[PDB]
Design an enzyme around this catalytic site. Structure first.
Site, PDB file in Angstrom:
ATOM      1  N   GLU A 286      21.132  17.541 -23.574  1.00 55.79           N
ATOM      2  CA  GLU A 286      21.447  18.891 -23.315  1.00 55.79           C
ATOM      3  C   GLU A 286      20.678  19.859 -23.981  1.00 55.79           C
ATOM      4  O   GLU A 286      19.994  20.887 -23.728  1.00 55.79           O
ATOM      5  CB  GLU A 286      23.144  19.314 -23.314  1.00 55.79           C
ATOM      6  CG  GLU A 286      23.804  18.457 -22.193  1.00 55.79           C
ATOM      7  CD  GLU A 286      23.667  19.159 -20.703  1.00 55.79           C
ATOM      8  OE1 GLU A 286      23.156  20.437 -20.593  1.00 55.79           O
ATOM      9  OE2 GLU A 286      23.861  18.579 -19.664  1.00 55.79           O
TER      10      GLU A 286
ATOM     11  N   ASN B 298      19.649  29.578 -16.594  1.00 63.24           N
ATOM     12  CA  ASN B 298      19.729  28.740 -15.281  1.00 63.24           C
ATOM     13  C   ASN B 298      19.402  29.363 -14.142  1.00 63.24           C
ATOM     14  O   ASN B 298      19.016  30.763 -14.147  1.00 63.24           O
ATOM     15  CB  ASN B 298      21.257  28.419 -15.153  1.00 63.24           C
ATOM     16  CG  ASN B 298      21.790  27.601 -16.322  1.00 63.24           C
ATOM     17  OD1 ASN B 298      22.896  27.894 -16.823  1.00 63.24           O
ATOM     18  ND2 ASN B 298      21.294  26.201 -16.652  1.00 63.24           N
TER      19      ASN B 298
ATOM     20  N   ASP C 182      20.610  31.084 -11.521  1.00 65.37           N
ATOM     21  CA  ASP C 182      21.841  32.164 -11.029  1.00 65.37           C
ATOM     22  C   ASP C 182      22.176  33.155 -11.936  1.00 65.37           C
ATOM     23  O   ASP C 182      23.014  34.115 -11.638  1.00 65.37           O
ATOM     24  CB  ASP C 182      23.056  31.220 -10.729  1.00 65.37           C
ATOM     25  CG  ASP C 182      23.834  30.720 -12.055  1.00 65.37           C
ATOM     26  OD1 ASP C 182      23.439  31.052 -13.129  1.00 65.37           O
ATOM     27  OD2 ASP C 182      25.112  30.110 -11.861  1.00 65.37           O
TER      28      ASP C 182
ATOM     29  N   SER D  15      22.805  32.734 -14.895  1.00 64.93           N
ATOM     30  CA  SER D  15      23.855  32.162 -16.004  1.00 64.93           C
ATOM     31  C   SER D  15      23.138  31.650 -16.861  1.00 64.93           C
ATOM     32  O   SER D  15      21.865  31.360 -16.970  1.00 64.93           O
ATOM     33  CB  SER D  15      24.942  30.989 -15.508  1.00 64.93           C
ATOM     34  OG  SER D  15      24.235  30.077 -15.342  1.00 64.93           O
TER      35      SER D  15
ATOM     36  N   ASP E  22      23.328  28.742 -20.333  1.00 63.02           N
ATOM     37  CA  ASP E  22      24.007  27.565 -21.050  1.00 63.02           C
ATOM     38  C   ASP E  22      23.719  27.805 -22.513  1.00 63.02           C
ATOM     39  O   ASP E  22      22.556  27.973 -23.048  1.00 63.02           O
ATOM     40  CB  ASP E  22      23.371  26.304 -20.655  1.00 63.02           C
ATOM     41  CG  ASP E  22      23.411  25.891 -19.130  1.00 63.02           C
ATOM     42  OD1 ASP E  22      24.326  26.621 -18.616  1.00 63.02           O
ATOM     43  OD2 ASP E  22      22.533  25.386 -18.726  1.00 63.02           O
TER      44      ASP E  22
ATOM     45  N   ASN F 282      28.508  26.812 -20.159  1.00 59.45           N
ATOM     46  CA  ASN F 282      27.998  27.818 -19.048  1.00 59.45           C
ATOM     47  C   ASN F 282      28.838  28.899 -19.038  1.00 59.45           C
ATOM     48  O   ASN F 282      30.063  28.807 -18.638  1.00 59.45           O
ATOM     49  CB  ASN F 282      27.769  27.173 -17.815  1.00 59.45           C
ATOM     50  CG  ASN F 282      27.106  28.221 -16.848  1.00 59.45           C
ATOM     51  OD1 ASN F 282      27.949  28.806 -16.087  1.00 59.45           O
ATOM     52  ND2 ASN F 282      25.719  28.193 -16.883  1.00 59.45           N
TER      53      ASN F 282
ATOM     54  N   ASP G  66      38.372  18.945 -15.498  1.00 60.67           N
ATOM     55  CA  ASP G  66      38.221  20.166 -14.575  1.00 60.67           C
ATOM     56  C   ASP G  66      37.862  19.357 -12.922  1.00 60.67           C
ATOM     57  O   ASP G  66      38.161  20.262 -11.890  1.00 60.67           O
ATOM     58  CB  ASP G  66      37.040  21.111 -14.437  1.00 60.67           C
ATOM     59  CG  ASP G  66      37.052  22.056 -13.703  1.00 60.67           C
ATOM     60  OD1 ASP G  66      38.241  23.115 -13.467  1.00 60.67           O
ATOM     61  OD2 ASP G  66      36.436  22.298 -12.873  1.00 60.67           O
TER      62      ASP G  66
END
Ligand SMILES: [Cl-]
Ligand code: NA
Length: 129
Positions: free
Chosen positions: A35, A46, A48, A50, A52, A59, A101
């Site tokens: 990562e 990212n 979208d 967004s 990280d 995120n 999740d």
């Protein structure tokens, strides 16, 4: 901070990630290499839109608020910036909630694409246990 491999393995164990939801310590250490290349300050956009953040790359759409991601849920009640620190606690509290999740560690595309199905013990081989 760019943790040492065994330094980071040691810290994540302190917070109880070794075998958390059945994921051995080495899967977490392996997630954190790929990562972020072991760097608490890591940040990547990212598509979208967004971003990280940090060691595990948490995120902003769900998990943290950065003020530029439409529809953010800030499901860790936290500023994304606080996850770039040298004190990995906020990142761990949040990671424990993500993994719990439902999709498990598949929430991390570098875990799916690179750790999963491998001998994740090479990632802690040489760590003082
Ligand atoms: Cl699972
Ligand atoms: Na959010």
């Amino acid at each position: 901070k760019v943790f040492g491999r065994c330094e980071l393995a040691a810290a994540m164990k302190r917070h109880g990630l070794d075998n958390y939801r059945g994921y051995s310590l080495g899967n977490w250490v392996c997630a954190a290499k790929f990562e972020s290349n072991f760097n608490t300050q890591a940040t990547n956009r990212n598509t979208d839109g967004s971003t990280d953040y940090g060691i595990l790359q948490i995120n902003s759409r769900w998990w943290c608020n950065d003020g530029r991601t439409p529809g953010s849920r800030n499901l860790c009640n936290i500023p994304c910036s606080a996850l770039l620190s040298s004190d990995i606690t906020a990142s761990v509290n949040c990671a424990k909630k993500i993994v719990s999740d439902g999709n498990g560690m598949n929430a991390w595309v570098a875990w799916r694409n690179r750790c999963k199905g491998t001998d994740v013990q090479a990632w802690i081989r040489g760590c003082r246990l």
